[PDB]
Symmetry: C2
Subunit: 315 residues, 2 copies
């Protein structure tokens, strides 16, 4: 199977490499992660929370991570240039809480004693693109307030806080709601707005969960009572629309089976999202995804990185 | 104590009779209701439901009603010209459900057997202003849909239905919410609007409780699925604002002890409501009330109807 003959046969084109972020397109970096290496990382189910993880599997420029002490059914895949993993020791140098292995209490864990018990190696620091050493997202400080879209209830723009800052990204948290609504963001995110944006648009602002008298909700009073500042208006950057067009082909991680990467086409587009179709599969498997998601890639990505590519499903 | 004497010490004025509805002002009708007379009436705490009620007390042009079979702690006062009471036998001739006395099954209650058991008399029909013999509210039929303010959550305007029609009034019900939010209305009510009013106002509409995918609520889809039509826009009338002014004196039922009527003053106003202050009492007892409410009356009303009036609280 080749992309060249496939595109010739389909009279189609791939999405040019120039439409991707460098982190999505880069194939010339070696994967330095090795089986058994230990590290810290974000739980994709609880994006505010950090766990001790072990490398369970490597495939191309991707790794499968295991939560030490828990079931292997929680394992998940990342790219080796993921900014959501960090070297052993990072949590204590940068102000982050680390969930210990199942069994430990969080004043009974140290890395030096845990590496001694397990005889394991921490992944070396030079492997990690994000160690809190890069310039921060200008203007967004921990504790500052903004208006954010709830991506699980996307018709709602809500009162939200910056609760974590790591390199050029920050965590959006919805005041008084479960942390499982949190998501990582940057200054150009189309989902975040300055305090006062809703009122300027004649849009309903959703106040914190069970705010007393939500009808009389007023930002100025809320900021005063919480000892908080608004993220300043100048910090918010216009992200321009992506340039993907319908029928352009690419490679995408299968969401039902994330060990696998399949030949995919752009089925539909919005300003900041694309709809993925897996060639040869039912359209029931189509899904919408952010154009900057780390799990879509230009054609050739699996081949240059050493990951198997699934061809179109054919007879 | 007299009004003439009091008005002179306060250098004050009474709200003129022409500011009130005729039904709030009328003093020359006699109270024909008698202790122990039985009738049917709306439960004020469940405005959609009808119960068997007994006259427990009469004071001037007011009567206290007791729910047969239930605790006296639920007793309530109405005026003798109330539209919310009907003669025995009305429910069956008009398509309404009667809740029987506590402990009876509905089906095993009949008025004639119940009058025989209690040896009581039904209040005669000529006492009742509302027997369902008058023209209906034009344009409002059972089953028609409209938008209504939820008076318990007054920032919300919601999908609502006409569920009952009695003489000149109709009952507004909030689709898929419980019946305790229902309220009685006429065509001039400030709280109701035609289908599509929110949209034209750039105001959000609250769809029925747990409507599947509530952001796409489409009135015309909803009207079709429910086999329903909109109340026509022509049927909604403008109510002009009241002309009560701050400082006018009047008489009002005490909401904490509703057997009592006190000298009151208008503390504040809106287009359709006044704020009542009880002379000589703490302002912590001030309350808002709709200006057409049956429990406010002009100065002189207690005197002319034979009801005791409480003078201002003094040292």
């Amino acid at each position: 199977w080749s992309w060249e003959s496939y595109l010739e046969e389909q009279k189609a084109i791939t999405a040019p490499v120039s439409l991707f972020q460098d982190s999505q397109a880069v194939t010339h970096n070696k994967n330095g992660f090795k089986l058994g290496m230990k590290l810290e990382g974000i739980d994709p189910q609880h994006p505010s929370m950090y766990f001790i993880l072990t490398v369970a599997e490597v495939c191309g420029y991707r790794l499968r991570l295991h939560f030490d002490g828990y079931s292997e059914c929680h394992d998940f895949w990342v790219n080796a240039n993921s900014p959501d993993i960090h070297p052993a020791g990072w949590f204590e140098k940068t102000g982050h809480k680390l969930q210990p292995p199942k069994g430990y209490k969080e004043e009974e864990f140290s890395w030096s004693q845990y590496l001694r018990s397990t005889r394991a190696q921490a992944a070396p620091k030079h492997l990690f693109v994000s160690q809190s050493h890069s310039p921060p997202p200008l203007g967004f400080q921990v504790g500052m307030k903004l208006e954010a879209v709830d991506r699980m209830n996307p018709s709602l723009v809500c009162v939200a806080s910056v609760t974590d800052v790591v390199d050029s990204r920050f965590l959006v948290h919805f005041d008084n709601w479960d942390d499982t609504y949190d998501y990582w963001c940057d200054p150009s995110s189309p989902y975040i707005h300055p305090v006062g944006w809703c009122q300027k648009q004649g849009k309903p602002l959703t106040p914190p969960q069970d705010y007393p008298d939500p009808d009389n909700f007023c930002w100025e009073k809320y900021l005063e009572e919480t000892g908080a500042s608004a993220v300043p208006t100048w910090a918010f950057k216009v992200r321009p629309p992506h340039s993907f067009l319908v029928n352009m082909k690419l490679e995408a991680v299968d969401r039902r089976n994330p060990a696998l990467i399949r030949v995919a086409s752009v089925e539909d587009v919005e300003d900041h999202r694309i709809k993925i179709h897996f060639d040869g599969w039912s359209h029931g498997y189509d899904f919408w995804i952010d154009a900057d998601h780390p799990d879509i890639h230009p054609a050739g990505w699996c081949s240059k990185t050493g990951h198997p590519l699934q061809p179109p499903l054919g007879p």
